[PDB]
Design a protein around this ligand. Structure first.
Ligand SMILES: CN(C)c1ccc(C(=O)NCCCCCCC(=O)NO)cc1
Ligand SMILES: [K+]
Ligand SMILES: [K+]
Ligand SMILES: [Zn+2]
Length: 356
């Protein structure tokens, strides 16, 4: 009944090697440890993923190439996803870390597993995208299929989880839900409310397009509402939740305007179903704030309520100028006309009827 935590000094150091977010893993783990939250969790070392396990989703041609590299401009290995030395070993560690976490759920060893360094949702079966060379969220879902018959994927990252959606857009065994910013020119440019899946998977893909400024209350209402209709019509067996913190105020991305307390309520709501739950990270470019967010969340997963003062630890200096765990919203307008949010929620409502 104690949450599993995918930790390991070799793993955390492996993660800190990704140039896009230098040292974010240490910072997150460290802050979580400074609150001594690992004290109330089942620390589990992650096993590196095998070439046969990655092959359950990615193609050999792609996997062979990722390896060779560790005409790249043919697999999406360029600006966003560089042909860096070691990415292969890097991806394997993150894929295996999520697979290792999934196995625990299908062994009753716990009702919740955590891997903050995971959540790379943009990767396609044979192509790297938006900083992702391998899709651990899919590997994790394909692993949960072994025991669970209906998996629900909720993506709370600032960006549309296109990679995971495409992977399952033709099936009704796995349903994806994504609340993300949608606007022309904003990566990856997919996921409008009209997007609902294809073929035998029609309606088993839910997309909530949102605009800048949205704050905690407006966001929870929207999320709580949709997660409601979905638990109704789908009646999931297990849940995979991606929690990219690039939605939180202060992120250089400067779009949404959330705080960890908003996402927290959404997390509570999902945990209330007591279904098996695999927690993942994702985007998050204000390093200190990402740690503030995932630590607080690790805290709602445990029922505990953390101190407002940031405990002294290796990265204590990065929490200035106030040195607290709370995040204050920025002073800028919510651009979500309340009438459009309703149109969308109805359009959703209607679409869920079609489910069994
Ligand atoms: C120098 N600098 C600040 C940047 C340079 C390039 C990009 C970019 O290509 N972006 C497109 C892909 C963005 C990936 C977002 C990953 C994510 O959060 N997914 O949810 C961005 C910033
Ligand atoms: K689907
Ligand atoms: K999202
Ligand atoms: Zn993101």
């Amino acid at each position: 009944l104690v949450p599993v935590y995918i930790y390991s000094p070799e793993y955390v150091s492996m993660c800190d090697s990704l140039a896009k977010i230098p040292k974010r893993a240490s910072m997150v783990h460290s802050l979580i440890e400074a609150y001594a939250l690992h004290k109330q969790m089942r620390i589990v070392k992650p096993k590196v993923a095998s070439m046969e396990e990655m092959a359950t989703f990615h193609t050999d041609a792609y996997l062979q190439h990722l390896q060779k590299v560790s005409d790249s401009i043919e697999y999406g290995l360029g600006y966003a996803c560089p042909a860096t030395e070691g990415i292969f070993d890097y991806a394997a560690a993150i894929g295996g870390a999520t697979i290792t976490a999934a196995q625990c759920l299908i062994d009753g060893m716990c009702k919740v597993a955590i891997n903050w360094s995971g959540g790379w949702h943009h990767a396609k079966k044979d192509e790297a995208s938006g900083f992702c060379y391998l899709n651990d969220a899919v590997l994790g879902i394909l692993r949960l299929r072994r025991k669970f018959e209906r998996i629900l994927y909720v993506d709370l990252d600032l960006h549309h989880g296109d990679g995971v959606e495409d992977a399952f857009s033709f099936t009704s065994k796995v349903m994806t839900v994504s609340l993300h910013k949608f606007s022309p020119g904003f990566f990856p440019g997919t996921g409008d409310v009209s997007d609902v899946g294809l073929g035998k998977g029609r309606y088993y893909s839910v997309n909530v397009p949102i605009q800048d400024g949205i704050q905690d209350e407006k966001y929870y209402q929207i999320c709580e509402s949709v997660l409601k209709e979905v638990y109704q019509a789908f009646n999931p067996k297990a849940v995979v939740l991606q929690l990219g913190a690039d939605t939180i105020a202060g992120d250089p991305m400067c779009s949404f305007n959330m705080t960890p307390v908003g996402i927290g309520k959404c997390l509570k709501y999902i945990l209330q179903w007591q279904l098996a739950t695999l927690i993942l990270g994702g985007g998050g470019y204000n390093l200190a704030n990402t740690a503030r967010c995932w630590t607080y969340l690790t805290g709602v997963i445990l029922g505990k309520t953390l101190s407002s003062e940031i405990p002294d630890h290796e990265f204590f200096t990065a929490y200035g100028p106030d040195y607290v765990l709370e995040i204050t919203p920025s002073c800028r307008p919510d651009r979500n006309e309340p009438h459009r949010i309703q149109q969308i929620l109805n359009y959703i409502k209607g679409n869920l009827k079609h489910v069994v």
